[PDB]
Assembly symmetry: C5
């Protein structure tokens, strides 16, 4: 198994590592029909999404998708600094695949 | 996908943005039969609900309605200030579709 | 839908509002068969329960009961003041139907 | 329904009330197969468990057990004082049936 | 049942105890297909994972795995000291079987 996020990220196509080194600036969450997602932004101006669960996801990614949204909400509320994000760049906003934080 | 709550809100009929910029003043939660809902208020007098899950909701919203109430409760308890609410105004009190927070 | 817990509570029979305006003095949780419940008490001597899920409850009340026990646990832990309780008074200890909290 | 942890504890066979009135010293959590359990210890010497789910539990006890582990984790992390524990003494280490915490 | 994590660890083959006595240095989480896992590292250089659920895991272990990720994120967030880790050493990074924390 991978041992860092850089590594996990280079196993997939259309992705990229973003070095954040910052807390989340805004948290957006929606429960509207077909728009059940989370958007975050940074002071740098970047915007990321956790995508609405869809046909592109495998079954084992569904619980992971709710956990990610859980993680982002709590990271926002505690002002925890995020280290890196591994994101899919064929979407807009770019879509979160993985996250890392370090103390 | 949408990049902000406002853009997401304007994909729906019967919605409107309230710019709150404030901590929730009060939190109500009910488990009584047919009234399984949350009600929040602001220092302004604005009252909002998370509707009781129903016929108007599609399957993918069911987890999202539950996430939304988890969000409103921890927001209330931490005194986190809400930025904007995207709400349906064909309900009374108005019904939340999406919420955003900024630090 | 109702806009306050008092209005909400008044839609049911065998219910009354308790105005607490105080933090929970003790929290009790049980996983014992047939007594899967939470009990809370106040410095006033008042005692209240979240009842065991039973044939009195309908379908949609199942997650709400779990949410209400989660809420009482975090309210206890953060020493958050409860404003009112809407309870069913045909049970002892009286049974929580709804909770509000003001900040 | 019972009104305190002691009345509730008296309804079962093989139980006993421990009045610890102290935080949890250590928290151990396992996901190893057939040992999916929580163990806690206190300064005064005792060691208690949350049993691995099994046929001795009825169906409404499955969610209760998960809740109980949730509670012991947060209680540990916050140093919340546990007042009493209703435990079954026909297991080793003794097994949690109920806990109480007080202000 | 085992009374400590070292007694529980030694019931399993291909396991060993890591005495960390330290707070988690980095927390990594991924929702990418087939890498639905969590990775933690320590100031000492040590690196550990929560494997992706698979056929080596029995159903009772599926909930325990979600529980273990939940525990690592909140442990990370609150800077809590991890006392010991019981890990499977036939995997890289080594895989968490059990965790323990004290004061
Ligand atoms: O490039 C991909 N996989 C390539 C193999 C990587 N590898 C898989 C086996 O174990 C080790 C890691 C790969 C790309 C994927 O990509 C797609 O779905 C994503 C959401 O997951 C995003 O929506 C992304 O925009 C989209 O293009 C999806 C999956 N998937 O959800 O199964 C795999
Ligand atoms: O305005 C709607 N359609 C607008 C399309 C926006 N959407 C973006 C993604 O691509 C699909 C279309 C729209 C209105 C809806 O409306 C209704 O349900 C809401 C709760 O869901 C509220 O209760 C609202 O008061 C009620 O009128 C419901 C849905 N729905 O639950 O599926 C869509
Ligand atoms: O909560 C109930 N919901 C079922 C229908 C609810 N309905 C829609 C919303 O506004 C008013 C009434 C409901 C609760 C009722 O109350 C009963 O169940 C409760 C738990 O739900 C309590 O245990 C209470 O002690 C018990 O007497 C009785 C009836 N009944 O006789 O129909 C309905
Ligand atoms: O928890 C039990 N609840 C089921 C019945 C509850 N009872 C119904 C009426 O209101 C008062 C309490 C119950 C527990 C019992 O105890 C058994 O299971 C427990 C876990 O739940 C512990 O593992 C304990 O060590 C074990 O002996 C034994 C019986 N029994 O031998 O019949 C019932
Ligand atoms: O080999 C295993 N069990 C077999 C023991 C059966 N038993 C042997 C002697 O006594 C009488 C009968 C066995 C191997 C295990 O290990 C396997 O799965 C683990 C996760 O569960 C890890 O992924 C690990 O790396 C992998 O080897 C784990 C378990 N487990 O978590 O239950 C059991």
């Amino acid at each position: 198994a991978p041992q860092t996020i850089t590594e996990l990220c280079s196993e997939y196509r259309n992705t990229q590592i973003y070095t954040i080194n910052d807390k989340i600036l805004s948290y957006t969450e929606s429960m509207a029909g077909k728009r059940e997602m989370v958007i975050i932004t940074f002071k740098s101006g970047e915007t990321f999404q956790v995508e609405v669960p869809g046909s592109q996801h495998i079954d084992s990614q569904k619980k992971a998708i709710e956990r990610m949204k859980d993680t982002l909400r709590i990271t926002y509320l505690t002002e925890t600094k995020i280290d890196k994000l591994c994101v899919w760049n064929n979407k807009t906003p770019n879509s979160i695949a993985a996250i890392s934080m370090k103390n």
